[PDB]
Each structure stands twice: as structure tokens, then as C-alpha cells.
Amino acid sequence: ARDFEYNNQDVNQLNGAFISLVEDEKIGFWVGVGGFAYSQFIMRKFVKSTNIFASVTSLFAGAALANLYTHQSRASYARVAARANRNASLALNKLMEY
Amino acid sequence: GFETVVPAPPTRDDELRMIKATEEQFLQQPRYKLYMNEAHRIAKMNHGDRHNNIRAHFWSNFALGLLITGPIFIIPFGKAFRNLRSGVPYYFRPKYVFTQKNQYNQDRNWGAMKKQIPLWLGLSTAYAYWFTDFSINDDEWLEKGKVIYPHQT
Amino acid sequence: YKTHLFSWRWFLIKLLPSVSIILLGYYLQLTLKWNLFNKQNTIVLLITLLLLYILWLEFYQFYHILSFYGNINWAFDYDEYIWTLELDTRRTRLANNYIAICLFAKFWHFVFIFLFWVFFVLRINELGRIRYPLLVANVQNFIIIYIMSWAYMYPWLKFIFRKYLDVPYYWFYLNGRELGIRVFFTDLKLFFYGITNRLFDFNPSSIKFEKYPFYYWINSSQLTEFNQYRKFVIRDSIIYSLNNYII
Amino acid sequence: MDNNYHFWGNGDRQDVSLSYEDYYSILDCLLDEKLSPQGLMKFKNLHEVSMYGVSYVPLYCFPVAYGISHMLTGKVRRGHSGYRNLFSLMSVVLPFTCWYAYTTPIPRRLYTEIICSNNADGAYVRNRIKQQKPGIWRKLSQQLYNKNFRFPELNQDLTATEFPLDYVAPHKF
Amino acid sequence: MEPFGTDERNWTHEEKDIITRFLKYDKHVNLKTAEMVYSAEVESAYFGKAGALAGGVISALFFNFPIVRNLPIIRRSVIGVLPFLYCYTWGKNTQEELRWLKTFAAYQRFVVYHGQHCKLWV
Amino acid sequence: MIWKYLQRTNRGNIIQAGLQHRKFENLPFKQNFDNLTKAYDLRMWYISNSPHEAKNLEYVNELEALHNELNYQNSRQFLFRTVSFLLGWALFYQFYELPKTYDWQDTQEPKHQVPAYGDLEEGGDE
Amino acid sequence: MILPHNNRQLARQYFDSLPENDINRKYYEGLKYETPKTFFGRFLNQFNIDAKLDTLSKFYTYQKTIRATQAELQEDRKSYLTNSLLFTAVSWFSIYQFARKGAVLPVLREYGRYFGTHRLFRQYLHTLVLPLLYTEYALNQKYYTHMEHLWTVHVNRLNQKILEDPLYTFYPQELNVPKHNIIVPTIFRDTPQ
Amino acid sequence: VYHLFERICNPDNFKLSGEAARVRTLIAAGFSKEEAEQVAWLQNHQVNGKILGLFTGGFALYCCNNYFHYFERYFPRLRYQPFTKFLAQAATVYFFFKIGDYYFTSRRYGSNDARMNGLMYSNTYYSTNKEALIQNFEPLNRKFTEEEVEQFLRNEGRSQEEKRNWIYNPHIHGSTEGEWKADIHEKFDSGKAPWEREHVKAKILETNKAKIDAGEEIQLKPFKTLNHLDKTGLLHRLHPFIWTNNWTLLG
């Protein structure tokens, strides 16, 4: 049976964005792990603080580093997906309006 | 594609209504906007309005880029003219005119300016083109060239 | 479709000797301040030999161009079973004739500068030393002839600047788009990404079959569809015959 | 990530990348009668972009060639005095930089739309490139397979009942 | 009637031999094209041996040249055979170049005659 | 505090730059292009910014010799680099397989090689 | 390209001639082939390239792609083998001459740890063995993906039970059908219209 | 670093954010442009009370924080327990929050009079919209049938600006010309929804027999939020405020 067909242009753009975003996500996860390790090493060696505070700071530093690395692909995919979802919703509403 | 139903020829009352609509559109046409009476007059005016909106956005972005890139790129870039690559401070190197530059740092300041101003303008226009959106007046399939008559509006 | 585009990969190798000559001339000019006539005879003779080589190449090309206009062919008279030589005129696109005239002018100019160089070398040999006026005059003659050597590359300029001419006026409302500067700033980014991907991302391999003959003469079939040029039926038949002969 | 991702002439990092030389070669083995009006419009837009892009490529390559020519001349910057040698030697250096740039493929939304379209026009262009331009199609198919595009024309098709017509380069399964 | 572009494969020796034999002995070709190929062959056969003979003579002279003669045999023979190698390779290269250029012109004529080029018509 | 970063200019952006001491602290023992050009720049700046006539004229005399020496060094550099570039170009084109499989449609003019109009070109006469 | 009635089904003939218990028989019955995904599996499969090529040649002889692959692989084997032999000969000659003159490259230990073999002998052994291993590895990497794709196509054909000769198959002259060159145009008749 | 610079210096960061964010989010979710606007209005009205209460509590704390210190005369617990003072401040903030929430979200029923409708004296518009939505909202508990899907696909090019000229080709439509014209008029010209056709309803009942046996009612018509939400109140026959409108509703 026939079914709603999405726009090929949007499909291709989303495919490219998704590939880039997956590659980023992976590399950025590794970068975040490395940044957490480095922040923990620095805190335990040069910073006079409690272990809980040092660990929290290291976790936040790693998360921030990963987000900085992966923001470009995440933002690009977010905007492309938002546009595609808006277009699909408008088309489906126009089709099913009664 | 499919064809719509063709209405029967208009009556005199319909003709009068169309004439009144065309008169109203002509009156609404701005005085300072010079567009010739043609089938594409309304399409051209809409295109011009969209282009004016894009122009406004582009010039705002260009002004913002001139404001921002200055302290960030051009001014630090001018720190490279403090000394030559040999380590000696900047001194004038004439080409054919041995201009007298007795004024303090005249040579260094002018040499830095000659490269900073073009760099400033280039970076500002790059910022404008990067952060300005042309979506409003972009037509990939050129479907906005359809003629719109004054009475239809 | 007659665009007349010549390959730059072929043009650069042909252009090499002239730039070599001009660079050697500049080096001789610069070194004349602290060098003697006997030592610089090496550079003078190298320049002379390079100029002779370029003169031979120019003469060969000029001879080919001038001999084009004489159309000589062999016609087989079957009644006498004899081949006979026949001469006829030529018909071709006038652009070819115009560029032939331009190349004739280039050849005459190169002969002139070659005679100039011969005169200069003979005079310096007689005098016993080189002089800046004549040396620099010869160097600038070499530079000018190098500039003129690009005469037959006008098709690229036409190919670039005819698509700008064919663009209609913006307000005639044919397409309502102007993307010059936009395309410039977008192509900056596109080239940046392309270069980064080329030198850091996946690059498809260039390996190919180098031994099997006529391997890449792909005849039409279900895999390649049948949307080829209509008269490629003969090409497909010839490919089939060649494959049969190979096997 | 510029603010004009909608623009057809624009491109993305992971979009299909095609060289200018490859595009001009592909233009040779195509017929307009066999393309739908939408495909013809796509090709016309692509030419509209390429008209400016090709002319701008040497502009992009100019600074690199200028620097290379200066380095070849030496470590002395003599301004107008050295223009003759700079531009006589740069007349061959800049062509090399333009050669590298043109051989470098660049992504483009129009390129990906034309090549990877799942319609009759896409199939026609892919088959024509496969048949009349095997050398270009080999690289194009390698790129598509690496970017997770599946078509019957690809040499890397693992679900095909017919043998490939070209050498299959090594890749990860 | 073959792929065009930088990524394509240059003509192979076997392909050139097959094409020239086809032009020589095929029925679909025209008498003028066949005559062109035959003239190419006959007029190119000379250089292959002319270059070899010139190289032999030059190498015979260079063996007894002022310095080569006094050089030891290991250096003498190697240095004296260089002109022969250069002339022989030049002769073979020019023979092949002339023959292949004229055969390719004949192939172009055949393609135009049979209308096998997608962008050529009257 | 936006003014403290926008309207406040660094002292180096206004006051004349000094001499980069690290550039001369340690130098090679070779009278090479680097040392020659360093001395040339030093003398040139001193001539530009000094009011002492006795030292400038001798500085001019020394600077002429420095210019000659730098010209010699540049000549050597130009020779070496140009020869290397030419040899590399020649070797690249010797070992590079030049594509000899380009389209030859341009060289063919079917309507011109065999005159399509035949005898109608000469006068007509119909 | 070959019409069904013009197809000689040489692949089907070979399949019939094959034995009862065969991997091709199992594939025809419906056994599915999946390329190894682990490093150990790929390393094991690296040595099966020759057998796969031989069986594919036996099945689809006269196939254009298979014939081209065979020719290219044979030429590559010859070229790599001769290059390796030349490299080994040159290295051995150089080592012998320099050892005669008293110069030995300071590579490898002077004496063996277990048998006390001399550095010269071990250098000869390495020069002989290493290039052969490198040649084998290079050829296997070059041809592994191509061989796997060809084998996957063959297995898919067997599973679908398509034993007819594939596309781009050119039989010899004996099996090539003659072309009828006798054509008699129909008698001309004035159109009634 | 180029992307980081872009993020920092994007002009959108300086540009003030608008109210279109909710509409865009709802459109991406699936609501139509009008439905998105109505839902965004409802959500904004619901949250405005809380935002205003928080702002009022903050302003009250800022202006009259000394009241907590003054109260120590009667409640020395504030003086001798700063934690108690902090809890009292939090309680005051929550009190303002709840007052605002009551003002903007509580039913606060009032008369439907044009003289005071929309003045916020009563939360009539919000109350009526919420009641209508909650009462008439019933998710479609079916699966769209093949006929409905085909009609939705066929509705790609339909437009009410100009009626389509339907042409009967026997070789692709079958049946008779009159029957085909009647069916086409029913499907498209009449505007009748696909689920309102008798055979479509029968197929729906046959396919959902299990739900019917379990006792669950099948909703033929999917919920239309724009048919029950109207920020202006015209749908619910709420009289517009006189001084901001130049027309009257009968009621």
C-alpha cells in the first residue's frame, strides 16, 4: 500500500547531518573522557579541594569540553531536523485537513 | 497537472468590479517606487520589497561585523607592524616617492592602516554574508515569477 | 560544442623552456655586478642553446600551421588502378585561421628577438665584457615573448567570460537572482571543507585494471540501461566482436 | 555552520563532493531530452553556481601561488623591482595551485541532489556516468558507499546478482 | 568511441595493435583510411633502424673518444654505449609516435565516417 | 567595564615599538643572510630616527656594502631555488603519465572537412 | 545481452558436473555466505582468495569481469614476484660485497640468542623472507575486497538458482552463433492511398 | 575556533527573542499554524501567572527584606536561626507564586459581558478553553484505513481557490460516467471526510471489532483542536471587549 513520501532533498540533508553528528558524538565522547581525566589529574595535583568537589569539577569540565567539540554537528542536525519536521507536519496537516 | 474549472465570461458588473480593483491597486502603488505598468509589475514590486528587507538585514549585519571584528581581528593584526621580522622597529621603506614622515609613528601607522582598512572591510562583508539570511527572496525552482494581476490581489 | 579547450597539463610543459630562459637571464643580470665575462659564458651559452631549442619548436609549429592550407591527398583511379596526388584548398572555422595568423606574428617576433640575442652575444664576445643596457634589453625581450606565447589560450578566457556576457539584466525579470559575491563567500567555505576532507578524510582509491584490453569499453545492457547515444549500436557490436576475439 | 543552509549552491561537510573537472566531464555524457524538467532546472542552477565558482577558483588560489613564487625567488621582498620575476615564475606556479584546487572535490547540495536522487533523473545520470565515464563513476561509487548510499549502479553492491563492471577498491565491510 | 577524461586509462599496446589491425583489414573501413594506415606504416618503418644505425656509429666513435678510450673497460663500455642507447630509444620512440598519431587520425576518420561520436554530425 | 576594553588602547599600540632583544641575544657565527639583514635593518632604523649626522653618513656607507652583500646572498638563494624548481618540474613531467585520452571533437569539422554545400558554393546558377 | 535461447548455461553444466557434497551445492540448496567481520576471520579468509578465484573461473569462464580479474591478478603476481626477487638479489649482492670489503650493516644482533647464527646469515634470511611476505600481504589486501564481492555475487546467484551465464559473457567462435547475412527486401508495391 | 566565534558573535544572540518559539516548536511537533498558535497562547496564559508571581515575590523581597529583621521582635526564631529566616523568605516567594497562579489559572468564573470580558476580572477565556479542550479531547483509537490513506495521498493537489475540472476516462476509471462523477463529488467536491463514508465506517468497525467487544467506543472523527480552542473566544460565543472591538456577537 502507498504511504506518505518524504522529500528526497530533506532526506539527503538529514542523512549527511546524521553521519556528521554520529562521528562527532563518538569523537566528542572520547574527548570528554580525556578532559575529565585531565581535569581530575590537575585538581588532585595542584588544587587544594575535597575529593567530591574535585570529581564534580572534573565531570563538568569533561562535559563542557565534549559539548564544545560536538556543538557544531549537534546544532546543524538540530536545525535541519527542525526544518524537516516542520515541513512534514505542514504537509501532513494539509493532506489530512477536513 | 490537473486543470481547474474555467469560469464563464464575466458580466458587466464583474468587469466594473475588476476595473475598481485595478484602480484601487494603482492608487495604492507608492509614488516614489518607479515600476512600469506591465504583467509583472506586482511580482517585481514584491521581489523589490523582499530585496529591500534582505538589504536592511545585510547592512545591519555589516555594521555589526565592522563593530565586532575590529577589536577582535584588525587591532590585534596591527600589532604585527610594531617590528620587522628582523626585530628592528618599523621604519619607512619607500618604493618610488621618498615621502617625509617626520610625524611620530607616521610610517608605522600608515603602513598598518593600508592593510587594516581593506582587512576590516573584507572581514565585515564576510561576516555580513555569513550571518545574513537570503531565504525570503531565494527561489530555487523560480516559482515566484508567476504573474499576479491587480484585480486578483 | 566547438569550445577549443587545450589542456593545461600539456601547456605547462611546453611553456617551461621560456620561463627557464627568463629566469637564467635575470640571474645573469643580477650576477653581472661581481662576475667576469669568461665565467658568465656558461650562462650565455645555456641561454643560447635554450633559445635555439625554442626557435626549432616555434619553426616546427609555424611550418605545420602554414602547411595546413595545402590540402594534399591520394585519389585512387580504379580504371587505371593507380594512386594520384591531388591538391585542393581548405575550408575550416575562421577562428583557426585567425589564431594561425596570430601564431605567425608570434613566430616572426620570436625570430626577431632571437636575432637580437645573437647580435648581443656576438657584440659582447667582441667587446670582452657584458653591459647592463643590452643585457636587460634581451631579458625584457625574453619576457615579452614569454607573454606573447600565451596567444592560443584565448579559448579559456572566452569560456570564462562568455557566461558572464550571456547573463541578462536583473530587472528584466528572467530569473531574479544575483549570486556573485554570495557564491564567492560560499565557495571559500566549500573549498575549505573539500581540502580538509581530501587531506584528512576518506579518499577513494585510484586502482584500476591495467592489463585487460578494451575492459572499460562498456557496451549497453540492463545494468547500464539503454539511454546512450542512439547510434552506439555499432559501438556495442564492435565491442562484442573485440571481446570475442580476445576470448 | 552559516545561516544559509537552505541555499542550493551551499554545501555541507558530509555532502557528496564532486570536482569541477568531474562535473564538466559529466556534463559531456548527458542528454537534455532524457531529463525531466525538474532535473533540467537542477542542472541549470548548478551551472549558474559553477559559472561564478570556476572563475573564483583562481582568485582563491592566488595568495598561495604568490607566496610560493616569493619563496622560490628568495627571502628578499623588493616590491615593484621584482614584479617581472615574480609574475613570470608565478605564471606557472599559479596554474599548479589551480590544478590542485580543481582536482580537489567540494561538497554541494546540488551535487548530492543530482547524483543521489531516487528518481528517473538520478538513475539516468548514475547509469550514464557508470557507462560513458567509468573512471569518474568508480570514485563516485566509492564515495557514495563510504557515505552510506545504496544504489544498483554502485560497484560495492553486496546484494546484486550480477558481477561488477569495475574494480572494487578495498573498504570495510 | 572510448572513455574520455583524466581518470580514464591511456591506450594500451594490445589495444593499439588491435585497432591498427582492425583499420588495416576490416571491411567497414574506407579505402582512404586503409591507405592512410598503410602510408603511416611504410613511412614510419625507417626511423626505427635509422636511429639504431646512427647510435651504433656514434657509440663506435665514443668508445675511442679521447677520455673514454683511456678509461677502464668497466667505465669505458658503459660510457660508450650511452649514445647508442639514446639514439636507439629515440628512433623507436619516434617511429611509434608517428605510427600511432597517424593511426589515431585514421581512427578518428573512421569514427566520423560511421557516425560513432555523440557530438559530431553534418 | 566595556569601555575599559574598547576605548582603552594598549601602550604598544601608541608608543613606538622597541628593539626585540631576543633576536640579537644569541646569533650564529656565520656572516649569513640573517645577520646581514639584521645589521641592515638596524642601520636603516638608526638613520631614520637619529639626529646625528656623523654616525648616519658612515652608517650609509656601511649600508651600501650591506646591500651589496645581501644582493649576493639573494642571488645565491635565487639560483639554488630556481634550479631546484626547474629540476623538480622536469622530473615530475618525466615521471608523470600525461593523460592522452581527451576528447578530440574540436579537431573535427564534418561539415567543413567535406564541403556540405558542394558545388552550390561556387556561384549557384539555378 | 545473451538471449535465453543463445545462452549455453556453461555455469549450469559445471554445477551439474560438480560432486554431490560441495560448497556450491550447499549454496544452491540455500546456504548463505557472510564475509568474516573479526580480524582472525579476515586473516583466515586472506588465504582463500586463490581457491575462490579458481572456482569462479571454472564456473563463469569467458565472463568479462572474471577474466579481467584473472589477468590482472596473474600480471600482479608476476610483477611483484620479479620485483621481490630483484630486491633480494640486489641486497644479497650488496651485503656480500660489503662483507668482503669488511663492512657489515649494524642491523640485527651480532650473534643469535639460541643457535648463535651470525648477523650476516640472519640478514640474508630476512632479505629473502621479508619481501615475499610483504608481496603476499600487499596482493591479498589489494584483491581481498574484490574477491569477496565476486564470491558474494556468486553465492547470491546460487541461492536464487540462477545457473545461466551472467551478463557480459562472450563465448568462443565455436559457441558463437553465425550471423545471417542474407536479407531479401520485400517487393516494392505502389501504396493504394 | 571558527564555530566558537560564530556562536559567540551570532547577531541572533543580541537580537531579542520573540514569542514565535512556542509556535515553531508546536509546528515541529505536528500542530498546524493556527493550532500551534492556540496551544502556545494557552500555555503562555498558564505560565504568565507563575512568572508574574515570581517577579512580584522577588520585588517584594528586594524592597522589604527589612521586615524579616523587624519581625524578630515578635519571632526571635528568625534572629537566632538564619535557616528559619531563609525558609520564611522562601515561603513568602511561594505565597506570591501561588497567588499569581490562582489569579491566572484558577477558574474564577465570571459573567459573559462585553463590558468587562477580557479585563482579567474573571478567568473566563482560559477556563472555557481548558474545559472545552478537556471535555472534547479524545485520541483517535483507530488505525487509518487503506481508503483513508489513499484519499489523504490523493488530496495533495486539492485547493478551494479554484475547483478542479474532473475528467472521466473509461480506460483508467472504470464503472460508468455518472457513478464515477457521483463518487468524485462525494470524495472531493462535497468536502465529506473519508471516515464519514458508510463503507469506510463499516470497515473500521470490522477491523476494530476487538475494541468494540471489549467495550471501547471508536472515534470516527479525529480530534480537531482548532474546533475547540479560540483565544479570542468567538468560538465559545464569548462577547469581545467593547472598547477593543468594533463588532458584537449575538451570543
Ligand SMILES: CCCCCCCCCCCCCCCCCC(=O)OC[C@H](COP(=O)([O-])OCC(O)COP(=O)([O-])OC[C@@H](COC(=O)CCCCCCCCCCCCCCCCC)OC(=O)CCCCCCCCCCCCCCCCC)OC(=O)CCCCCCCCCCCCCCCCC
Ligand atoms: C582598496 C583599499 C580598501 C578600501 C576599499 C575596499 C576594497 C576595494 C573594493 C571596494 C568597493 C567594492 C564595490 C562597491 C561595493 C559597495 C557599493 C555600495 O555601497 O553600494 C550599495 C551596493 C548595493 O548594495 P545592496 O543592493 O544593498 O546589496 C546587498 C544585499 O545584501 C544583496 O547582496 P547580494 O549578494 O545580492 O549582492 C548585491 C549585488 C551583487 O552584484 C553582483 O552580483 C555583482 C558581482 C558579480 C560577481 C563578480 C563578477 C566580476 C568579477 C569576475 C572575476 C573573474 C576572475 C577571472 C577568472 C578567470 C581567469 C583567472 O547586486 C546588487 O545589489 C545590484 C548592484 C550591483 C553592483 C555591482 C557592481 C559594484 C561596483 C561598481 C559600482 C561602484 C563603484 C566601484 C568602483 C571600483 C571598486 C573596485 O553594494 C553592492 O555593490 C552590493 C554589496 C557588496 C558587498 C558589500 C561591500 C561593502 C564595502 C566594502 C567591501 C570590501 C571588499 C570586499 C568585498 C568585495 C567587493 C564587493
Ligand SMILES: CCCCCCCCCCCCCCCCCC(=O)OC[C@H](COP(=O)([O-])OCC(O)COP(=O)([O-])OC[C@@H](COC(=O)CCCCCCCCCCCCCCCCC)OC(=O)CCCCCCCCCCCCCCCCC)OC(=O)CCCCCCCCCCCCCCCCC
Ligand atoms: C606464515 C609463515 C611464514 C614464514 C616466512 C619465512 C620466515 C620465518 C620462518 C623461517 C623459519 C626457518 C628459518 C631458518 C632457520 C635456520 C636455523 C636457525 O638457527 O634459525 C635462524 C633464526 C634463528 O636462529 P638464531 O641464531 O637463534 O637467532 C635468534 C635471534 O633472536 C633471531 O634474531 P633476528 O635477527 O632473526 O631478529 C629477530 C626476529 C624477530 O623475532 C622475534 O623475536 C619477534 C617476535 C614477535 C612476537 C609477536 C607476538 C606474537 C604473539 C603470539 C602469536 C602466536 C601465533 C599466531 C599465529 C597466527 C596465524 C599465522 O626478526 C626480526 O626482528 C626482524 C624481522 C621483523 C619481524 C618480522 C617477523 C615475521 C615472522 C613471520 C612468521 C611467523 C611464524 C609464527 C609461527 C607460530 C609461532 C607461535 O631464525 C629466524 O631468524 C626466524 C625467526 C622466526 C620467528 C621466531 C619467533 C620466536 C618467538 C615466538 C613467540 C611465540 C611462541 C612462544 C613459544 C614458547 C614455548 C612454548
Ligand SMILES: CCCCCCCCCCCCCCCCCC(=O)OC[C@H](COP(=O)([O-])OCC(O)COP(=O)([O-])OC[C@@H](COC(=O)CCCCCCCCCCCCCCCCC)OC(=O)CCCCCCCCCCCCCCCCC)OC(=O)CCCCCCCCCCCCCCCCC
Ligand atoms: C489586564 C487586561 C487589560 C486589557 C486591555 C485594557 C485596555 C484599557 C481599556 C480600558 C477601558 C475602560 C474599562 C472600564 C471597565 C469598568 C468596568 C465595567 O465595564 O463596568 C461596567 C458596568 C457593568 O457591570 P455590571 O452591570 O455589574 O455587569 C457585570 C459585569 O459585566 C461583569 O461582572 P462579573 O461577572 O465579572 O462580576 C459580577 C460581580 C461580582 O463582583 C462583585 O460582586 C464585587 C463587589 C464589590 C466591588 C469590587 C471590590 C471593591 C472593593 C472595595 C473598594 C476598593 C478597596 C481598596 C481601595 C480603597 C477604597 C476606599 O461584580 C459586580 O457586581 C460588578 C460591578 C462593577 C463594580 C465592581 C467591579 C470592579 C471594580 C474595581 C475597581 C478598582 C480597579 C480600577 C478601577 C476600575 C477599572 C478602570 O456597567 C455599569 O454597571 C454601569 C451602568 C451605568 C448606568 C447609567 C448610570 C447613570 C448615572 C446614575 C447615577 C448618578 C450618580 C450621580 C451622583 C451625584 C452626587 C452629587
Ligand SMILES: CCCCCCCCCCCCCCCCCC(=O)OC[C@H](COP(=O)([O-])OCC[N+](C)(C)C)OC(=O)CCCCCCCCCCCCCCCCC
Ligand atoms: C595575450 C593574452 C593571452 C591570454 C591567454 C591566457 C588566459 C588564461 C585564462 C585562465 C582561465 C582558467 C580557467 C580554468 C577552468 C578549469 C575548469 C575545470 O574543469 O578544471 C580542470 C582544469 C583543466 O584541465 P584540462 O585542461 O586538462 O581539462 C581536460 C578537458 N579538456 C580537454 C576539455 C580541456 O584542470 C587543470 O588541469 C587545471 C588548470 C588550471 C589553470 C588555471 C589558470 C589560471 C590563470 C593563471 C595565469 C597566471 C599568469 C601570471 C600572472 C597572474 C596574475 C595576473
Ligand SMILES: CCCCCCCCCCCCCCCCCC(=O)OC[C@H](COP(=O)([O-])OCC[N+](C)(C)C)OC(=O)CCCCCCCCCCCCCCCCC
Ligand atoms: C653522454 C655523456 C657524454 C657527454 C655529453 C655532452 C652533452 C651534450 C649535450 C648536447 C646539447 C645539444 C643542444 C642542442 C640545442 C638545439 C635543440 C633543438 O633545436 O632541438 C632539437 C631536438 C628536439 O627536436 P624535436 O622537434 O624532436 O623536439 C622533441 C620535443 N619533445 C621533447 C617535446 C618531445 O633537441 C633534442 O632532442 C633535445 C634538445 C635539448 C636542448 C637543451 C638545451 C639546454 C641544455 C643543453 C645540454 C647541456 C648539457 C651540459 C653537460 C651535462 C653533462 C652531465
Ligand SMILES: CCCCCCCCCCCCCCCCCC(=O)OC[C@H](COP(=O)([O-])OCC[N+](C)(C)C)OC(=O)CCCCCCCCCCCCCCCCC
Ligand atoms: C625573417 C626573420 C626576420 C628578418 C628581419 C631581421 C630583423 C633583425 C633585427 C635586428 C635587431 C638588432 C638590435 C640591435 C640593437 C642595438 C642598440 C644599440 O645601438 O645599442 C644602444 C645601447 C647599447 O648599450 P651598450 O650596453 O652596448 O653600451 C652603452 C655604453 N656604455 C656601456 C659605455 C655605457 O643600448 C641601450 O641603450 C639599451 C636599449 C637598447 C634598445 C634597442 C632597440 C632596438 C630596436 C630595433 C628595431 C628594429 C626594427 C626592424 C623592423 C623590421 C626589419 C625587417
Ligand SMILES: CCCCCCCCCCCCCCCCCC(=O)OC[C@H](COP(=O)([O-])OCC[N+](C)(C)C)OC(=O)CCCCCCCCCCCCCCCCC
Ligand atoms: C602536563 C604538562 C603541561 C604543560 C603545559 C601546557 C599544556 C597544554 C595542554 C593543551 C591541551 C589542549 C586541549 C584541547 C581540547 C580541545 C577541545 C575541543 O574540541 O575544543 C574545540 C574548540 C573549538 O570548537 P569548534 O566548534 O570551533 O570546532 C572544533 C573542531 N571541529 C569543527 C572539528 C568540531 O576549541 C576551543 O575553544 C578549545 C579551547 C577552549 C578554551 C580554553 C583555552 C585554553 C588555552 C588558551 C591559550 C591562549 C594563549 C594566548 C593566545 C593569544 C592569541 C592572539
Ligand SMILES: COC1=C(OC)C(=O)C(C/C=C(/C)CC/C=C(\C)CC/C=C(\C)CC/C=C(\C)CC/C=C(\C)CC/C=C(\C)CC/C=C(/C)CCC=C(C)C)=C(C)C1=O
Ligand atoms: C567556514 O568557516 C567560516 C568561514 O569560511 C572560511 C567564514 O568566511 C566566516 C566569516 C567570518 C569571519 C569573521 C571571517 C573569519 C576569518 C578569520 C578567523 C581569519 C582572519 C584572521 C585574522 C585576520 C587575524 C590575524 C591576526 C593575528 C593572528 C594576530 C597577530 C598578532 C601578533 C603577531 C602579535 C605580535 C606582537 C608582539 C610580539 C608584541 C611586541 C611588543 C613590543 C613592545 C615590541 C618589542 C619591544 C621590546 C622593547 C622588546 C566564518 C564565521 C566561518 O566560520
Ligand SMILES: CCCCCCCCCCCCCCCCCC(=O)OC[C@H](COP(=O)(O)OCCN)OC(=O)CCCCCCCCCCCCCCCCC
Ligand atoms: C531549590 C532548593 C534548594 C534551596 C533553595 C530554595 C529556593 C526557594 C525559592 C527562592 C527563595 C528566594 C529567597 C532566598 C533567600 C533570601 C534572599 C535575599 O536576601 O533576598 C533579599 C535581598 C535584599 O537585598 P539586600 O542584599 O538585603 O540589599 C539591601 C540594600 N540596602 O534581595 C535579593 O537578593 C533578591 C532575591 C531574589 C529571590 C528570587 C526572586 C524570584 C525572581 C528571581 C529572578 C532572577 C534573579 C537572579 C539573581 C542573580 C544573582 C547573581
